[PDB]
């Protein structure tokens, strides 16, 4: 499924036939790479010092290198802003994950949520 | 007593604010240098006009990056708070992710333990990455404003410097404009004609919203700011949560003999434009409100603080109470009173004794004694206060020396004076009412007599406007608002020549007679196409200020006989209502937080924990009239004070060894209630309802 | 439940987060 | 003694007769104002929310205004650097001084 | 378990370092994209040459301000540390304000309580204002490097990215150049000829300076950096303590078909110049040393860490010990030995049994049994090890099957092999010595036989240079250094035609005979004006490598018979000395920190507290020979291990109920000493000196 | 005096400041 999605994205990125397809595919690739980068950052922070989802994220980054580099630069820039300005929110220390099932258990509660419903 | 980063950051920011205040005080003496410095000190330097301009350019150059840092942080914080307020009014309040949920209280989360540390940091990081590219919809942002104390000192110092440089008809008539007690600095007030009363002045429609912790925004309407689209950063509304984006906008909008020394006038110019502190205060209103709520004990203690100047109820009531205590303990002249429990002889003895006592005052204590009744405690004075309040507010007759004094103009629970062909007796009665309110304010008590907003504003010495008429009679306020709104229609004279109103009004029975003109020449001048604003303002000032001018003057003089003209300064109608009348209705939460629960029975039925729960369920499941009768059984008063400092004895419920034979006893002078321990909840409820009726 | 049934005598050791309004309570801690 | 020192400094600052006197007096004034600013900052941090030494420092600042403004700007800039870069050294909290003798006792040891 | 600013800052910096490492790994695959990515994955994009240059420009643009932040902070920290090191060597060590004082220890200040919080902040602020205008003379700066953990993660990430881009004769002969075990990265080594031995190699002059916590700088000389005057910031030595000044210098020096994809080679360019990581490592050497000392447990655990690659003794000894434990527990083949307490039959039985056992090894345990003596504990093996060490190091004769094996070249306590017309017996003896050292390294014990530095460097497989001759014979090293220094004088042949030395040398009695030539054709070639470097290097390699080549080869093969060629990689002479021979001399502090003080007497003389003080005063007031006899009475070894992990049983002193009748008893296999409680300190001292002699 | 006379069993709760060298000990705390 991952290679199917990547093949569809590359095929629509290499489409210089119909007008407006290339920038549309570029924006779709930016949004997908932002989501993949967020998942990869959460998984890499949760693990200790390669697992299968990190390998899948690395494969996605390698298949779309010149855009993933820019979006990872933006993600790191966003992570490094509150340290340099001295406005970091205080948090409690936590222990790392020796195995991979506990990291999946902790990342399940962060991403499998629902948006706020509207007022009835 | 341990080392922390935030303590050192706050201390360094306080030192920086001290030095910036010293720099501002030094720069403020330039136009009067030769009078204040070069006339007294034997050693001083010579200052020219160009040197002042060079100094101003130097100081404006050397305070750029801290200004950019502060403006970026405050813009991001205000954007996050405004998005939280926007998401609060568009979501389901029953969801646990809603901002107005009980799970979002920080004290309720700590008491529920008796989530994990990894999950909090993961949520903080996920909120950090989503905020970079504006991808934070339907998620409440993760921030802690209580960890931003070092930003507030720098903000206070820069506002101090800006404020120090800055200070050194028909529709456009000053009757339809709100005063300082109903506006916001740097914000556009709502339109008084195109907005209905339900979303313009919600305190007039719902008078029960007045609380000591109530905000200004939900009592007087939602303000608006006209900042959108303009290339400078200060002319655009802050909508982005990212610190990097706001810093980028700030920097991009950044780098986008002669005259005498008396003529030097500095101007604030950081970003190529003139900067006033009013629009800076209006730009960050929610952050300033939260800063004043959480940072008053240390940040608000600085000299020239903007948090103290923008203080709410708790800032002003403490200053008023300590000044009242100082002026009470300044003198040592006592006042004594003897009354009896009735109406006619009570009011006659009250008028006679209050005339005989100073027929400003220096009353130290007030002692009240009931005839043919025992008791010499402090609760006897409170019983006298509520007795004289219900005697003056009752409607039977005038007890010799004829109309009743007060009447309700259309809102339940609020009263205005009735002139009724004012003789010398009615004026003396109103002066006595004003002196009674003055001694009640002096002695830290509550007098349960409620006046309208304009009646309070006459006593405090404030201008009455068109918005005060909504607190007098709301329905004809709305009718006149629709008449103004229809007076500007395209048909013009089609609706004007339908009823053909004149400049004379038919008064009601309480206000007097009827068929009274407003302007000279009387009824012969009908409503023209353009006279309607004048007709409305003459009608409003006739019904609020002309009919009862003498009783209002008498009550103002009676209030000024005891209190000087230095304590009513910087007071408002609402904190006057909260200081004299208390909170109005009786709630359960404050009554829970006021009690002490002294234990003397020594009985250990599951370490109590069930009799107290049954008692508070009985109080919470009780009608408000029975609640007022309950509070009259505690401290002989039908209302609660606004804060803990209004109780000179603390409230106390004290348990007794179990005996199902007698009603619980009351000690009014020490605010104590001795209750015997019972078994059944229904037995407790029946005993309480039998005890409160007396 | 969770609400205390008596006064806690204010316990000292305050950070001012309890003085925040009900509308802005999610933005403060402790 | 303070007015004597200030009079000597002003007299040497207004000396356009011998070469090299004005810049020399300017540098001397910078060093003296730096020391006065450091003492004033320590005393003002130690006090709570005017005392005689703070009044003396204010008199010194008022007698030499166009240089004291610049040196106070430098002092504030130096104080505000470690907060903005997020590298402040952690310290324990301390209580303020209600009177003036304890502030003098604490500044004596420094 | 509480909320802190520094934990969140360190966690965010760790996340940033993870993303920067991922960016570096993505950018490293560009020149081999069509082989590694566009040959296996079915979906990939097409990459051109210009897109790689655009990506490199984008990444170099988006990592500027964090680079400026890190470089300014590291420059200020290194300036403060270097000024502290400069003030330490110019002040009085007896003053309490000196850096090398006992009052400056953080653990000693906490134990002394059993200054005020205002004074610490006042000192910090006074150090902050004095550092702005370079007014900080004779005052030690106030800083905490342990609160700078978030800077180290960003520094590690940027060094990772720089290192990833970078990696993707006469006097100038490689004999007078130091190796990697004696140089510093990015620093100029000292001149080997113009500097005397007292301030060039202080470990050679004082061999007692080798400690497990000893620094590299005070063992091998002071390095120097040639950075002064050059307009870029990286070419100027950092001398200013102010963060603002360093940031100002950093910013001012900042803004002062085509080719195939295989030919793309990135170059590091932040500030307009090429940047190597070696000069960045040499620029901040003290900060990197302190970062490796205090931030190894968390910051040093990251993949590709520069702190682990620059690790000292404790990093390498732990890895070596865990690999030794794994290789020991991999196999299950035991070794047994029977010996007797003498010299000749002990060495004969040792040679016979060690030849019979594998005449690589897989020895799991070693068991030693003394003939006509009881005992089967682990201390019997240690007694055998020190017995065979003192038997091999003793100088009487050769016990049949003739010269003694080892001799001292001029430094006391260090030994080199003597060839002595090498037969098959001497070679087998040296192979047995190497195998004995191998089993001692495998079984986590100490063999008290000490070799010179070049003897260890032959076994480890390292090149011997001119600086290794100072550990062989220091006085004639100094004489030859003065001969080199006088060989370049202006008089030239005036001092050359004074002694007329030749290319033949007279050897000593231990090295062999005498009158041995160095080069072919022998004595008929005197010293020319320019041949002196060649004469020195041939003489040095003749006396260190030619005479004893076969014993060194035999010992290398004996060490390699047990240990593979994967554990001696990345080992040095000094940690080989510390792992085999221990610390050498016996100190009091480590012996204090190793003891346990088990109490079983039950007697309460002032809760002890005086017998222990008298005991440690007795140990501290004791001669070193008696200290070695004391340590031989604890664990049957004359030396202590370098760390706590060398003790498989922990050391233990155990008290007894008081009885002044017997000497204290020793249990060697559990490292326990049972001592009876005494009364007098002199009685305790006399009993200890009588017990240690045995 | 001030030096402990026995092992403290390392007590956990370490910040790494005790591992600093003797020459650089004034620059670290706890």
Q: Can you count the helices of chain A?
A: 5
Q: Provide the gyration radius of chain A in Å.
A: 18 Å
- For the terminal residues of chain A, how far apart are their CA atoms? 38 Å
Shape of chain A: globular
Biggest β-sheet strands, sense, barrel of chain A: none
Q: Biggest interface, and residues per chain?
A: A-E, 40 and 46 residues
User: SSE string of chain A, helix = H, strand = E?
Assistant: HHHHH
Instruction: Give the oligomer, counting copies of the same chain as homo and different chains as hetero.
Output: part of a larger assembly
What percent of residues of chain A adopt helix (DSSP H or I)?
Answer: 55-70%
| Count of strand segments of chain A | 0
Output the structural class of chain A.
mainly alpha
Note the beta-strand portion of chain A. under 5%
Biased composition (Basic and acidic residues) (chains B, E): 107-114
Region (Disordered) (chains B, E): 87-114
Active site (chains B, E): 669 (glycyl thioester intermediate)
GO biological process, one term (chains B, E): progesterone receptor signaling pathway
